[PDB]
Amino acid sequence: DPQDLYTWEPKGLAVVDMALAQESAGLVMLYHFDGYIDAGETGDQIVDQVLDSLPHQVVARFDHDRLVDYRARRPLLTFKRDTWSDYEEPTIEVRLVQDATGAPFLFLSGPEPDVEWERFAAAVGQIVERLGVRLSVSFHGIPMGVPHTRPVGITPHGSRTDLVPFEEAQVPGSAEALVEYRLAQAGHDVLGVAAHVPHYVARSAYPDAALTVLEAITAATGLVLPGIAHSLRTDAHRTQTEIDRQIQEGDEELIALVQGLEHQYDAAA
Amino acid sequence: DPQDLYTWEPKGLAVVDMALAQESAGLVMLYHFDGYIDAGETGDQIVDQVLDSLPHQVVARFDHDRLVDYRARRPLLTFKRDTWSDYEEPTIEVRLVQDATGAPFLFLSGPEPDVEWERFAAAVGQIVERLGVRLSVSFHGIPMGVPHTRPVGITPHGSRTDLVPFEEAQVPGSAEALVEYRLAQAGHDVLGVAAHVPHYVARSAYPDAALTVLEAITAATGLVLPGIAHSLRTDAHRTQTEIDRQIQEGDEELIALVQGLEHQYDAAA
Amino acid sequence: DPQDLYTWEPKGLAVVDMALAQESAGLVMLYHFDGYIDAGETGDQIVDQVLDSLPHQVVARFDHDRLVDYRARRPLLTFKRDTWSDYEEPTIEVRLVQDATGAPFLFLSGPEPDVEWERFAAAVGQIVERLGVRLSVSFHGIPMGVPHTRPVGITPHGSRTDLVPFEEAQVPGSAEALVEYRLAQAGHDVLGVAAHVPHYVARSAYPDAALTVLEAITAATGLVLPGIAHSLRTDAHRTQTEIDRQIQEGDEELIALVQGLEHQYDAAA
Ligand SMILES: [Mg+2]
Ligand SMILES: [Mg+2]
């Protein structure tokens, strides 16, 4: 049943098994899918930065042809000349990656599965067990009533909340969330980091939120990612400038919104 | 093939088989899913009232992990502290229930399956056969050009129309409708009851419609449900008061709408 | 795996095998699904005209119960009296058809599969191989900045572009497109014909576009379809009259739109 959902790449698996043999602690796995709420593209930016900047290769491939609804989110063909020249498969993969140090870690990403989340969670549990994963770490942005002119708040959640140095709510499920819940029920350590992203900047990239999340992750896992922190820092500068001019040049109501949210923020702590 | 879609709870099945042994007529099954048009939440109110008020337990469990698209309708996790504390599975179940008398009946409900309706209908046919179901009964609200100030009309439909004491249309299918159609083709008695709900109150609870449907059901099946009829009656009083003040305090056009629909209604019969 | 997705009708298959025995060239297959962009209903009109006008029968039936999301596009039941009298199955079928000559060809149509496009493409490849298909031909409308007062442009694409007597883009995939891409990778000849349909008439029937596409198809395949060309020609006359009166009687901005698009059109070639 759940094992039918994925297959192993021997190269990636050999390299993992050699990391496991040389370090008894085991590996961290980061995971994040594209398809649920992710205010400010906080998780999406991090996924992009990892896969674009760091050396990696596949270790397990999920069967996206069974898991991904193609009419709902239509993968891109490329047209060149006259004919189809290429196709972006909507892959869902566990990759072996190295940080700037050369330290190995795992990274599970692609489109959020549309279906069969219980079987998918159970598959991810077998992968976590087979690859000696010691900690699984999810991350995303949630839109909040907070100002862009104050630092990004975060909500760490899961069983390893202690790694990031009153509340009872119902949240629409996502595949990562159910994966996290099933992993914890099986005894595995989970953390998650949700960035608090200002509602009114939520539907573009908010690099400050990706940066603040990347530094909680890096602080919690011991992974070292200075090039990515730097690129995000740079984007955040450009983005704060753009946001300032928008508010400054807009509506009275929008100005009054930011000041009203600043006041709420400063009055709390 | 269709048997893979569900499994039996032995406790619930034993209790059913003992009901079957003591009454040769067999049982009635009510069924209603969440996911198609149900003006006034007519079916939804009845589902809620049954499952909340009457003693019941599972007899068959469908494989919701195969049948329910999780990204389209995302089941709720609960967050408590710091971490996921619980999860509302999107279950699809045939339950044994007793009315206020202690008379047994079956109740099939949960999210409307998104996929595989032919295999699902055929599974429900095997369940209906194995559990000695004598009558299957669906129920929902359809939005109509009728006034809230006149009684709820109903359209009984199916092979047992006689149980509720000119027309040729194409209707978007729903899982219950295709189940009803396949059951009838296999010789099984089906009724359905559609409440006529005023368009302009259709997108909230319209307890009058649930009440009028509950009393056709109860009259057609011999089931006795006075506590539920009472709670619905009470809600309907509150709801008629709210609607009256809305129309009375709104637009000229809305007042003119209700009077125009009253006139149409009174001129017919 | 892919063979589970369809079954053969022996009658249709015998008649195909006899066509194959009498003509070594093999057959052409046209295919077009309902569910992706098709400006002006260009492909839809052709599908309708073929299936309504020409003698045909099933050769292969796909398992729509696995491939078609029923809640997303709900097949029609028919209500008559009092009860369900009929049901429009959302079939996906390869049909044997004859043109006005009696020349055989194949026609694959129904709702675009929602899921499992890789397995579906591979199934269509086995069907193309088993039925001696020499050319597979897709066709649809794309909305463009062009005037309704100038002829319909077309973009032929695929490996047999030569049959219809600078450009590098990413296009959302559709099932036909991925089928075309997999077929070409397996050595099979594909053509496609996309009609350029004026944006502002795109969301109804634009018979001129179906006609222009039908004549490229007919010219590329050697099929003869004069009755269908005639009906489309007739609709196009009615449609050009309706569009002229709309523009003529509308906004200054809409008049200025058509003239601005005419100017762009005439300045190119
Ligand atoms: Mg969907
Ligand atoms: Mg599916």
Q: Please tell me the distance between residue C194's alpha carbon and the centre of ligand 2 in angstroms.
A: 29
Specify whether the CB–CB gap between B120 and B33 falls below 8 A: no
Partners of C133 in beta bridges: C27
Chains that touch A (3 or more CB pairs under 8 A): B, C
Resolution to one decimal, Å: 2.2
Region for residue C13 given its phi and psi (left: phi exceeds 0; alpha: psi -120 to 50; beta: otherwise): alpha
Write out chain C residues lying below 8 Å of A69, CB-based: 69, 114-115
* Closest chain B residue by Cα to residue A37: B71
C-alpha A215/C-alpha A231 separation (Å) is 13
Q: What is the per-residue DSSP string for chain A? A: -GGGGEEE-HHHHHHHHHHHHH-TT-EEEEEEEESS--GGGHHHHHHHHHHHHS-EEEEEEE-HHHHS-TTTS-PEEEEETTEEEEE-----EEEEEE-TT--EEEEEEEEPPSS-HHHHHHHHHHHHHHTTEEEEEEEEEEEES--TTS---EEEEES-GGG----EEEEE--HHHHHHHHHHHTT--EEEEEEEEEGGGTTS--HHHHHHHHHHHHHHH----HHHHHHHHHHHHHHHHHHHHHHHHS-HHHHHHHHHHHHHHHH--
Write out chain A residues lying below 8 Å of C35, CB-based: 71
State whether B69 and C74 contact (CB < 8 Å): no
* Nearest bound ligand to the CA of residue A68: 2
Nearest to C160 by CA among C124, C122, C120, C193: C193
Instruction: Write the CATH number of the domain with boundaries B1-225.
Output: 3.40.50.10900
Q: Please tell me the distance between residue C88's alpha carbon and the centre of ligand 1 in angstroms.
A: 21
Is the Cα torsion angle C242, C248, C254, C257 positive or negative in sign? positive
Which residues have CB under 8 Å from C269's CB, separation 6+? none
Q: Please tell me the distance between residue C33's alpha carbon and the centre of ligand 2 in angstroms.
A: 18
Q: Please tell me the distance between residue C68's alpha carbon and the centre of ligand 2 in angstroms.
A: 8
State whether C80 and B168 contact (CB < 8 Å): yes
Nearest to A70 by CA among C173, C111, C68, C33: C173
E strand map for chain A? 6-8, 27-34, 56-62, 76-80, 83-87, 93-98, 104-111, 133-144, 154-158, 168-172, 190-198
- Stretch (H or E) spanning C130: helix C117-130
Whether C73 and chain B come into contact, CB under 8 Å, resolves to: no
Whether C177 and chain A come into contact, CB under 8 Å, resolves to: yes
Specify whether the CB–CB gap between B110 and B34 falls below 8 A: yes
* Closest chain C residue by Cα to residue B37: C71
* Amino acid symbol at B111: P
Specify whether the CB–CB gap between A208 and A178 falls below 8 A: no
Q: How far is CA A17 from the centre of its chain?
A: 25
Exposure letters C158-174 (e unless 16+ CB within 10 A, then b): bbbbebbeeeeeeeebb
* Nearest neighbour of A65 by CB, restricted to C69, C118, C157: C118
Let me know how long chain C is: 269
Q: Please tell me the distance between residue A65's alpha carbon and the centre of ligand 2 in angstroms.
A: 10
Partners of C29 in beta bridges: C106, C136
CA distances from A145 to A48, A153, A239, A257, A258 (A): 27, 11, 19, 10, 10
Cross-sheet strand order for the sheet of B83-87: A168-172, B76-80, B83-87
C-alpha C155/C-alpha C157 separation (Å) is 6
Specify whether the CB–CB gap between C198 and C147 falls below 8 A: yes
Chains that touch B (3 or more CB pairs under 8 A): A, C
Whether B250 and chain A come into contact, CB under 8 Å, resolves to: no
Whether C35 and chain A come into contact, CB under 8 Å, resolves to: yes
- The structure tokens listed for B46 are 């009845």
C-alpha A88/C-alpha A95 separation (Å) is 17
Write out chain B residues lying below 8 Å of A177, CB-based: 77, 84
Helices (H) and strands (E) in chain A, counts: 8, 11
Place of tokens 């097949």: C75
Partners of C138 in beta bridges: C192
Q: Which of C36, C37, C70, C116 is the mutation pick for testing A, counting most A CBs within 10 A?
A: C116
C-alpha C30/C-alpha C190 separation (Å) is 10
- The structure tokens listed for B169 are 């249309």
* Nearest neighbour of B74 by CB, restricted to A115, A161, A172: A172
- The structure tokens listed for B254 are 């809305």
Whether B75 and chain A come into contact, CB under 8 Å, resolves to: yes
Query: At CA B23, angle to CA B18 and CA B26, rounded to 5?
Result: 95
- The structure tokens listed for A261 are 């949210």
Number of Cβ atoms within 10 Å of the Cβ of B250? 12
C-alpha B8/C-alpha B130 separation (Å) is 11
Q: Please tell me the distance between residue C51's alpha carbon and the centre of ligand 2 in angstroms.
A: 29
State whether C69 and A65 contact (CB < 8 Å): no
C-alpha distance across the termini of chain C, in Å: 50
Write out chain B residues lying below 8 Å of C81, CB-based: 166-167
Place of tokens 């006609």: C211
Write out chain A residues lying below 8 Å of C169, CB-based: 78-79
Specify whether the CB–CB gap between C51 and C43 falls below 8 A: no
Exposure letters A127-165 (e unless 16+ CB within 10 A, then b): bbeebbbbbbbbbbbbbbebbbeeebbbbbbbbbbebbe
Place of tokens 């009077």: B259
C-alpha B146/C-alpha B178 separation (Å) is 27
C-alpha distance across the termini of chain A, in Å: 50
Q: Please tell me the distance between residue C214's alpha carbon and the centre of ligand 1 in angstroms.
A: 32
Interface list for B 196-225 with C (CB within 8 A): none
Coil, strand or helix at C38: coil
- The structure tokens listed for A89 are 């498969």
C-alpha B127/C-alpha B104 separation (Å) is 16
- Stretch (H or E) spanning B92: none
Number of Cβ atoms within 10 Å of the Cβ of A219? 12
Q: Which of A63, A66, A74 is the mutation pick for testing C, counting most C CBs within 10 A?
A: A74
Instruction: Write the CATH number of the domain with boundaries A226-269.
Output: 1.10.287.100
Which residues have CB under 8 Å from B266's CB, separation 6+? B150
State whether B173 and C81 contact (CB < 8 Å): no
Let me know how long chain A is: 269
Q: Please tell me the distance between residue A70's alpha carbon and the centre of ligand 1 in angstroms.
A: 9
C-alpha C227/C-alpha A221 separation (Å) is 71
What are the domain boundaries of chain A? 1-225, 226-269
Write out chain A residues lying below 8 Å of B88, CB-based: 170
* Closest chain A residue by Cα to residue B115: A115
Whether B82 and chain A come into contact, CB under 8 Å, resolves to: yes
The phi and psi torsions of B78 (rounded to 5 degrees) equal -105, 135
State whether B71 and A112 contact (CB < 8 Å): yes
State whether C157 and A82 contact (CB < 8 Å): yes
Whether A70 and chain C come into contact, CB under 8 Å, resolves to: yes
Say if strands A190-198 and C93-98 run parallel, antiparallel, or are unpaired.
unpaired
C-alpha C189/C-alpha C184 separation (Å) is 6
Partners of A111 in beta bridges: A34
Whether C70 and chain B come into contact, CB under 8 Å, resolves to: yes
Place of tokens 């579906």: C120
* Nearest neighbour of B112 by CB, restricted to C68, C71, C78: C71
The method recorded for this entry reads X-ray
Query: At CA C221, angle to CA C218 and CA C222, rounded to 5?
Result: 70
Q: Please tell me the distance between residue B69's alpha carbon and the centre of ligand 2 in angstroms.
A: 7
Partners of C191 in beta bridges: C137, C158
CA distances from A252 to A25, A197, A200, A239, A240 (A): 55, 22, 15, 21, 19
Number of Cβ atoms within 10 Å of the Cβ of C238? 11
Let me know how long chain B is: 269
Whether B1-225 shares its CATH topology with B226-269 is answered: no
Q: For the purposes of burial, counting CB atoms within 10 Å of the CB of B115, is it exposed (0-12), middle (13-18) or buried (19 or more)? A: buried
Place of tokens 């590098």: C168
C-alpha A218/C-alpha A232 separation (Å) is 14
